[model samples]
Target: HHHHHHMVHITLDRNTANSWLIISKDRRQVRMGDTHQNVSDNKERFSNYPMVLGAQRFSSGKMYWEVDVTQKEAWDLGVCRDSVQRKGQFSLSPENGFWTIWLWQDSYEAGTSPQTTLHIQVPPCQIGIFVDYEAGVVSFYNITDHGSLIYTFSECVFAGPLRPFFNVGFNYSGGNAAPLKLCPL
Candidate 1:
């Protein structure tokens, strides 16, 4: 419950960002670029998904971070293993190396095998994520309201170092213009 006490600083890793994604110079905010930048076609770059990885990686202990998703119509945020596939279409399921939650059309869903739709009383504008690597738990909380629990993925078998992951979803029309910003504690 006090995971926020151990806040971690996670910035966007531009090298892993999608070509059309715009990562702020500070690396804390990420938005869809008005136009795609002429960047190298690195395999680590997300070709199809509008996603990015954290600059830091964690292998153990409890780590916490918050993201500001205000005004965003759709987005995905969570932790993923270093081995997660960066090419082609990939499932956001935990078994596929991604333990995430996404919002679309005002509906929130957990990235499970069957994917559970979360019926949160109040939509979360700010989200807090807590990962206990040793205890094998990953939880998402609505930081706006006393860190209310949104969903928890427990008994996870972390195969390797895990990194913060994010995606603003495919907002080609700029409906989701707000950058998904990493909150600095």
Candidate 2:
């Protein structure tokens, strides 16, 4: 896992950010907004989905990025196709253009059709995503805990450019108060 440390810069997309998610001034950190804003409609905006898209798009390459999930209560992060539905509640399965991992209440899970359950003694402070488009693989790493392998999606079919995806889920009562920061290389 040491050799897998390839640096890549990624920023959260403001337009694609949910109304309840606040994007930082630098566009690298995102967290739950104080409250849901009364914003205008747009195609890129996620209406019912509490997620945001990355600014960069990847069609093919060896890519890697990390998210500092420290102090967060819940989160989902990975890659998703540009065509992913943003209007309403949707599954985070690969068939739906989402290859992601989620954590809630100290537990981890993979976003698949039937949703794969994950086992880990402790939650990760930083989650790393490594993608090999040519190899058709998406791997997730627990960066803060000795670089352990959390989960991997093998034999992935890249229909189009896949962008980084993130969601803190719904922040009812401000429970998800932590910001998801994109670590600097």
Best by lDDT: 1
C-alpha TM-scores of all predictions:
0.96, 0.94
User: How much is 176 displaced in model 2, in angstroms?
Assistant: 1.2
Scored by lDDT, model 1 comes in at 0.90
Clash list (residue pairs), candidate 1: none
Our model 2 lands, by Cα RMSD against the true structure, at 1.4
Taking the tens digit of each residue's C-alpha lDDT, what string does model 1 give over 24-128? 889999988777888877888988888999989999899999999998999999999999999898789988999999998779999998889997998888999
- Total clashes for model 1: 0
Number of backbone clashes in candidate 2: 0
Cα lDDT tens digits for candidate 2, 68-126: 98877788999999989989777789889999999876678999889888976657899
Best-matching candidate per TM-score: 1
Roughly what TM-score does model 2 have, to 2 decimal places?
0.94
| Poorly placed runs, candidate 1 (over 4 Å) | none
Q: What's the alpha carbon RMSD for model 1?
A: 1.0
